[PDB]
Amino acid sequence: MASRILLNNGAKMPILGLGTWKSPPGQVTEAVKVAIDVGYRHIDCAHVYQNENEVGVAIQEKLREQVVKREELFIVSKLWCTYHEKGLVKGACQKTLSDLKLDYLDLYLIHWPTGFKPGKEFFPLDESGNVVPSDTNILDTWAAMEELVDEGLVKAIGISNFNHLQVEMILNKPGLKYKPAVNQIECHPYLTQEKLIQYCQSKGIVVTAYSPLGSPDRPWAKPEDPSLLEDPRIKAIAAKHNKTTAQVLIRFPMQRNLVVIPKSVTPERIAENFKVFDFELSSQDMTTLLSYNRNWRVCALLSCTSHKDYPFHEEF
Numbered sequence: 070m071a072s073r074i075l076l077n078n079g080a081k082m083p084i085l086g087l088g089t090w091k092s093p094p095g096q097v098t099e100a101v102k103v104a105i106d107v108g109y110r111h112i113d114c115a116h117v118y119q120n121e122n123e124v125g126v127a128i129q130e131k132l133r134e135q136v137v138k139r140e141e142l143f144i145v146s147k148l149w150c151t152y153h154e155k156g157l158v159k160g161a162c163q164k165t166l167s168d169l170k171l172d173y174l175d176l177y178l179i180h181w182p183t184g185f186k187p188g189k190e191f192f193p194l195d196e197s198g199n200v201v202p203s204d205t206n207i208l209d210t211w212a213a214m215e216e217l218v219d220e221g222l223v224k225a226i227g228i229s230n231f232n233h234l235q236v237e238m239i240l241n242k243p244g245l246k247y248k249p250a251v252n253q254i255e256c257h258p259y260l261t262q263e264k265l266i267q268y269c270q271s272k273g274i275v276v277t278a279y280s281p282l283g284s285p286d287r288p289w290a291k292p293e294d295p296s297l298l299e300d301p302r303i304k305a306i307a308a309k310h311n312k313t314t315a316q317v318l319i320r321f322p323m324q325r326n327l328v329v330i331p332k333s334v335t336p337e338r339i340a341e342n343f344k345v346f347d348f349e350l351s352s353q354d355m356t357t358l359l360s361y362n363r364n365w366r367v368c369a370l371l372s373c374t375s376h377k378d379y380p381f382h383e384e385f
């Protein structure tokens with residue numbers, strides 16, 4: 070199937086990207102260089118991952134070496150929660166641009182709907198541990214994002230971890246100038262997201278699936294948690310197709326018209342993970358993988374469950 074999907078800003082986005090959350094700063098430059106060498110043209114980044122400088126070193130060498138042209142790359146980053154204030158959004162975007170060594174981003178996302186007190190700490194907590202919110206609302210933050218488009222710093226803006234009523238709030242914003250191009254959400258066979266995906270797609274919002282392999286390196290993993298990569302039912306589908314389990318887990322969202330961003334710092338897996346355009350899951354296989362849903366989340370933002378904009382109390 071086609072390697073890019075068209076966004077509602079008129080640009081095309083590669084449906085397979087490289088994730089960089091938890092990629093160590095001393096390994097991610099090589100990981101991104103290898104990814105671009107073996108075909109990746111989309112890199113998913115974020116300021117809160119604390120490795121954008123090192124990602125940028127890789128992008129800049131491959132541009133300098135003329136392995137790729139800037140127009141052929143699709144670089145994504147995300148506004149962290151402590152920068153939702155109007156007077157802080159441009160500088161947060163410009164810090165990311167400087168670190169990535171870019172003059173524009175292809176896509177910039179609000180990382181979470183929850184704004185936090187600005188300061189040095191990414192998770193400012195009170196005298197009892199609760200996240201300290203900011204009195205920013207989603208709509209003024211969105212307006213700040215819209216200005217970034219009008220200043221040329223980003224080609225597209227979007228959202229991440231927004232539930233459907235939060236997406237709706239932006240779509241119904243008075244004076245809305247640019248619709249979100251993307252909602253990036255967790256999605257895999259144990260969290261299949263059928264309701265939120267259908268909502269977003271019905272509105273021409275492209276969905277990106279994060280943690281598609283179930284994030285086995287997540288810092289809070291527990292031996293007793295489910296494991297997609299070890300699920301014998303998914304291994305059997307892989308075996309049937311003579312592919313790896315990870316390749317089946319990456320092809321699965323692709324066939325739902327999603328974008329997907331598997332993370333690896335291992336050269337062999339970076340290359341393996343891109344070899345997903347040569348096979349097809351049947352509709353039966355797709356329905357079977359959807360049947361594994363258990364509403365299980367990797368990323369539940371547990372420190373923020375009382376924030377007014379916490380996204381995961383709503384069904385979807």
Ligand SMILES: NC(=O)c1ccc[n+]([C@@H]2O[C@H](COP(=O)([O-])OP(=O)(O)OC[C@H]3O[C@@H](n4cnc5c(N)ncnc54)[C@H](OP(=O)(O)O)[C@@H]3O)[C@@H](O)[C@H]2O)c1
Nearest residue numbers: 088089090279280281282283284286315331332333334335
């Ligand atoms: N918007 C958000 O809030 C949000 C949240 C979470 C994630 N994300 C984005 O989504 C990306 C992907 O999600 P994720 O990092 O949580 O996890 P993931 O992509 O589901 O899983 C990454 C893990 O799987 C391993 N792996 C990769 N390929 C493999 C293969 N072929 N065989 C076996 N294991 C394999 C990696 O190991 P090695 O690296 O050691 O090879 C790493 O431990 C992130 O990196 C980030 O860019 C966004």
